[PDB]
Design a protein around this ligand. Sequence first.
Ligand SMILES: N[C@H](CCC(=O)O)C(=O)O
Ligand SMILES: N[C@H](CCC(=O)O)C(=O)O
Lengths: 276, 272
Amino acid sequence: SHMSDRLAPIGIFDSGVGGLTVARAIIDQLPDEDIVYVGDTGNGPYGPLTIPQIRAHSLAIGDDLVSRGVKALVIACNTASSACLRDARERYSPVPVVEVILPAVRRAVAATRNGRIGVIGTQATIASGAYQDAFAAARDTEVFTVACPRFVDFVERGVTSGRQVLGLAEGYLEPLQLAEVDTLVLGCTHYPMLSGLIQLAMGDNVTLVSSAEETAKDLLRVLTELDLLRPHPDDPSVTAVRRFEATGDPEAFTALAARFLGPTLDPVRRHAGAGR
Amino acid sequence: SHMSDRLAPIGIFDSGVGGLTVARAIIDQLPDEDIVYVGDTGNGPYGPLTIPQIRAHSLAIGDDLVSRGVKALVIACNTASSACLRDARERYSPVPVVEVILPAVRRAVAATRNGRIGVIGTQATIASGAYQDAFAAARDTEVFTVACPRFVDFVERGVTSGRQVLGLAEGYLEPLQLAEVDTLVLGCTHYPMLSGLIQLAMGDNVTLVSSAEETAKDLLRVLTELDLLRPHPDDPSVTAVRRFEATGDPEAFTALAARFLGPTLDGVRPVR
Ligand SMILES: N[C@H](CCC(=O)O)C(=O)O
Ligand SMILES: N[C@H](CCC(=O)O)C(=O)O
């Protein structure tokens, strides 16, 4: 029924742990929604892969989530979305698909002043033509794209300021500076963690657009116009059920998740057993 | 000459728990930095108070953090910032002061297409004239300001979508819609939690500017320029020391902090 639709969880999937930037932004906007997040740590990263390989891995997860019963499917990974942008809507219909490319593209079109827009992302994302095709539907805009393959490594290791990563960013970004873009889509789950460094390299006249923020807001809009929001609980002891799944080692998932989740705030020892 | 130790922590303070949006954004950008966060839950909220009241509460905490040796001071609270924007830098010099009004103001000036910019925030923030003063250098710019006092309540109770809060937002935001602003400064710690609802109310053309995000990037720039970044540890078992203090009830602080920090590793346990 439509009521049972409102009660289903939101499915989110990503190539791995970086998609938690999208999950965290969604939870910020939609605290009442139940969440199932799947990170494909056992088969990623997707960045360096071919389109057939990316589709095989990511559509297996999306098919599974939809088979399990989600009210909406969020493709949090820019690389996975780039590989199935043209067919995921029909593949999962009538389940709404919210993904990370189009909300940022739409925002960037509205946000540019000079009509010259840059996109950065993984190799597979940029090579796929997905952003290029999406921006083709925008009058009076020109798009320029750059792949930044080493950014994911730097983010996961926690090196997101200082001279070394600035030099790396400068090398990648120079063609966008030469093209005089005034808007830059952060087309990768990991790049919100580099926004300060990228802003330093691009200067103050370049508007950065976060995939996580625009997708989180887009999901709220989509659920609102479909009347699919989970009703706010009257009992304040009721809180959302959020489940996190890894296809690789869960301990490695946990260790890397601290890069993307909020900090833990700053514990008696006891021997556990059934003998007392 | 003065002591400015890159190994010392960054001090962040706020009227309460809402400033964790700023602390979270800073930590996103600067994972290696030690942090001391103070939220004035024992004396806030600041929104409905007078300027002498806001200054007395917030400068007490700022003075404490600086006396404790922080290498940089972040005023995460838009209301506190509005009350001491004119004198905080001089008061704490030579300790760098980064706050939440100026970086978003500079961004909004760059971001507008039609030159019409809105600002929303607490009563005290909007009445202070601080944003009007910050925008005084903006040419070919018209600025419109609106106070949204009940937004803080709705954010803290987690009511940030649906018909009731949309109607609240429309009542506040109508003067900005009539002014046809195309850029909107979220001039309050709590308002990033309403960005989806506010974007709905304002339409898809309006660029929202987050104070937390622009201030986090500005701190990275400032620490970089001053050669003040704490170095990346070579042993990755070494992690940043982060302390979070409240002037009010500490259990109440911990409970409300979840609204702004999101799920954390204390509770997340992944399955295979
Ligand atoms: N999640 C991927 C980044 C990591 C990967 O290459 O798998 C993306 O957003 O493009
Ligand atoms: N921290 C305040 C919001 C809460 C309060 O009124 O104290 C601000 O940013 O304006």
